[PDB]
Amino acid sequence: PPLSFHQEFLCMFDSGNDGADVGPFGPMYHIVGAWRLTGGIDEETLREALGDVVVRHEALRTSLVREGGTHRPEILPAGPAALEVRDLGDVDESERVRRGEELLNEVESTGLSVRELPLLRAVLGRFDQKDAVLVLIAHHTAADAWAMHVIARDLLNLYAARRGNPVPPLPEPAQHAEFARWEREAAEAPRVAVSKEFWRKRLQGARIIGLETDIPRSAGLPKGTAWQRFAVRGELADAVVEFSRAAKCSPFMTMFAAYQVLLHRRTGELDITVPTFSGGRNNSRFEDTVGSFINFLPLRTDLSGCASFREVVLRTRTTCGEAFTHELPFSRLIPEVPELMASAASDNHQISVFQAVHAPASEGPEQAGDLTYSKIWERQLSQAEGSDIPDGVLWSIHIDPSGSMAGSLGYNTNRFKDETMAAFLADYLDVLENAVARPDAPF
């Protein structure tokens, strides 16, 4: 079982054995999610189901241990099924959403090693016999956002079946090891050489844009990542969706375009390269597969001579189109363009990423047997010390089918002050509002 291309990418951010258990192979590099559960719960059966879902998915039993400078995967037997339960209190609805968010944040501030099991934990916060919040946490080498959606679906299905309630069969999943194999076969395909030649040309002289940090790398402050949560207001959300529809661009392309406009205004640059993370799940064989598939994907757009926001969005659409056509695993692309990140490691800058969360489509509450479950996307509570960002700034946007959007802005507290990032976020929301309100005005 070799490291995936994604895991190779993470190695590029690994601080090494250095006295500090931090970064992507440390215990804070995890992903958390929360679901509101309506219906009665048998806790013992839910715990058994959690055991079931770890047996089901090898990625959730694949530890990563330091060996000879790198990390060796080893697929282990599932550990003991475990579930923590808390009595959050029989309180009124607004207090429930609030206590749910607090539980989510508290779990995110706890650690979860990759070096031994478990790689998935669960905390169930119950309000009363028929309302609860289920929080899952998984190491982010083992699961991405799409994987967390799969874990929750599988878990509640396996639970329902144990309870003897009607649910459809789960498909047999492909294991992540199978994907690790497949992606290396794909890397030898003839289109690869064609795509490499595309990227060498496209990214000639390109440098990912850096954000100036408040605190230099050399100050050596302890690693931490904070998160500021935001939501795109109904009015603004509706304007973004309508603009995008009419422009024949996705809402993500619009929000990415607005980010480019913001960086142009912040840095003066017109030649703008900003990475996103693609979903990395083009191959539908792996749609029921738990693992971390996402892929660092550089998007270079030339904003020079743009007459309007609309033209920025259209150029973005072009850039996105050719990026996905020629997409390559970043660990294989970067040696072809080896100076692309020269502002990642600089003493006074970090790179930022702007991503859409990739997760299967859902509109409304879902049901498994006698349980209804609804992903909690709207977060408002910021986090002083949460899921780790190895080295940079991350914008993470969830775009709801309903029209609504929930976002997070994460940054390393050893490099940025909260106020700087607060202003950055507020500047972005203002740019976005003005852009879709007057998209054909001079930019």
User: Is the backbone peptide bond immediately before 118 cis, with ω within 30 degrees of 0?
Assistant: yes
H or E element in which residue 149 lies = helix 145-163
Binding residues among 139-158 for Cl ion as defined by CB under 5 A: 144-145
> Does the protein bind Cl ion through residue 58 (CB under 5 A)?
no
Taking CB positions, which residue lies at the least distance from Cl ion?
A: 144
How many residues in the shown chain lie near Cl ion by CB under 5 A?
2
Q: Residues 394, 421: contact at Cβ < 8 Å?
A: no
Instruction: Give ∠ CA 23-24-25 in degrees, rounded to 5.
Output: 95
Residue type, 215: I
Residue 418 CA to residue 365 CA, distance in Å, equals: 34
Contact window for Cl ion (CB under 5 A) among 137-145, 218-226, 400-408, 431-439 = 137-145
**In the complex, what is the shortest distance from the CB of residue 145 to Cl ion, in angstroms, rounded to a whole number?**
4
CB closer to Cl ion out of 144 and 400: 144
Residue type, 148: M
User: 414 φ, ψ to 5°?
Assistant: -75, 0
Q: Residues 327, 293: contact at Cβ < 8 Å?
A: no
Residue 165 touches which of Na ion, Cl ion, none (Cβ within 5-8 Å per kind): Na ion
Six-digit token string for 51: 């055991």
Residue type, 236: L
**In the complex, what is the shortest distance from the CB of residue 127 to Na ion, in angstroms, rounded to a whole number?**
21
Alpha carbon of residue 31 to chain centroid: 8
Sign of the C-alpha dihedral computed for residues 298, 300, 245 and 355 taken in this order: positive
Exposure class string for 109-123: b at 16+ Cβ within 10 A, else e: eeebbbeebbbbbbb
**In the complex, what is the shortest distance from the CB of residue 163 to Na ion, in angstroms, rounded to a whole number?**
6
CB closer to Cl ion out of 301 and 352: 352
Nearest CA to 354 out of 296, 436, 413 is that of 296
Is 20 in a helix, a strand, or coil?
Answer: coil
Instruction: Give ∠ CA 96-102-105 in degrees, rounded to 5.
Output: 145
**In the complex, what is the shortest distance from the CB of residue 67 to Cl ion, in angstroms, rounded to a whole number?**
26
CB closer to Na ion out of 290 and 323: 290
CB closer to Cl ion out of 107 and 145: 145
Contact window for Na ion (CB under 5 A) among 107-115, 191-199, 288-296, 393-401 = 107-115
**In the complex, what is the shortest distance from the CB of residue 112 to Na ion, in angstroms, rounded to a whole number?**
5
Contact window for Na ion (CB under 5 A) among 4-12, 108-116, 152-160, 305-313 = 108-116
CB closer to Cl ion out of 143 and 368: 143
> Does the protein bind Cl ion through residue 409 (CB under 5 A)?
no
Sign of the C-alpha dihedral computed for residues 142, 148, 153 and 159 taken in this order: positive
Residue 113 touches which of Na ion, Cl ion, none (Cβ within 5-8 Å per kind): Na ion
Residue 65 CA to residue 80 CA, distance in Å, equals: 20
CB closer to Na ion out of 129 and 325: 129
Contact window for Na ion (CB under 5 A) among 99-107, 161-169, 189-197, 415-423 = 161-169
CB closer to Na ion out of 121 and 317: 121
Among residues 38, 110, 165, 372, the one that binds Na ion under rule CB under 5 A: 165
Is 380 in a helix, a strand, or coil?
Answer: coil
> Does the protein bind Cl ion through residue 52 (CB under 5 A)?
no
Residue 145 touches which of Cl ion, Na ion, none (Cβ within 5-8 Å per kind): Cl ion
> Does the protein bind Na ion through residue 113 (CB under 5 A)?
yes
**In the complex, what is the shortest distance from the CB of residue 277 to Cl ion, in angstroms, rounded to a whole number?**
7
CB closer to Na ion out of 113 and 346: 113
Instruction: Give ∠ CA 237-238-239 in degrees, rounded to 5.
Output: 90
Residue 70 touches which of Na ion, Cl ion, none (Cβ within 5-8 Å per kind): none
CB closer to Na ion out of 113 and 250: 113
Chain positions contacting Na ion, by CB under 5 A? 113, 165
Chain positions contacting Cl ion, by CB under 5 A? 144-145
